[PDB]
Amino acid sequence: AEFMNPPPPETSNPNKPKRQTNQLQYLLRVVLKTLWKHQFAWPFQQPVDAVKLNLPDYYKIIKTPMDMGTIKKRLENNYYWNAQECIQDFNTMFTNCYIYNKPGDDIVLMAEALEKLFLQKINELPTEE
Ligand SMILES: CCNC(=O)[C@H](C)NC(=O)Cn1cc(-c2c(C)noc2C)cn1
């Protein structure tokens, strides 16, 4: 933990209500699994370290950070109540990339590849049972 980076998003909290659903299960076993192993996943596998990357303004611009390392912890810890909360995390991660970086930057193309997979899988999100 460098003190000039924020604390990561919460991945545990006993006061937050929690539930398993078939949809959250799919999000872990199918969606995360698929995206995590992708060739271009590695920048999204942990919070942005703005100190190491020499991007002092990152957390001035990006006020709601998210990454797949956090999402994986949230899924594995059953932090979520529903699939929408998890899907919103993924959407936040993509949008933060697209807001902070120039169109056609490598990092943007990488995010775009992951988001394309994501959309395919979320289109097949099972009916809640
Ligand atoms: C703590 C370990 N961390 C790394 O291994 C290093 C520090 N990360 C990288 O080199 C690659 N990276 C680029 C970004 C990024 C994203 C996402 N959106 O905009 C930017 C800019 C995030 N990670």
From Swiss-Prot:
Subcellular location: Nucleus; Chromosome
Effect of residue 106 to G: Found in a patient with a neurodevelopmental syndrome; uncertain significance
Interval of the full protein contained in this chain: 44 to 168 of 1362
Subunit structure: Interacts with p53/TP53; the interaction is direct. Interacts (via CTD region) with CDK9 and CCNT1, acting as an associated component of P-TEFb complex. Interacts with RELA (when acetylated at 'Lys-310'). Interacts (via NET domain) with NSD3, CHD4, BICRA and ATAD5. The interaction with BICRA bridges BRD4 to the GBAF complex. Interacts (via NET domain) with JMJD6 (via JmjC and N-terminal domains); the interaction is stronger in presence of ssRNA and recruits JMJD6 on distal enhancers. Interacts with NSD3. Interacts with NIPBL. (Microbial infection) Interacts with bovine papillomavirus type 1 regulatory protein E2. This interactions may serve for the tethering of viral genomes to host mitotic chromosomes allowing successful partitioning of the viral genome during cell division.
Source species: Homo sapiens (Human)
The family this protein is said to belong to: Belongs to the BET family.
Tissue-wise expression: Ubiquitously expressed.
UniProt cross-link Glycyl lysine isopeptide (Lys-Gly) (interchain with G-Cter in SUMO2), position: 60
Protein name, entry field: Bromodomain-containing protein 4
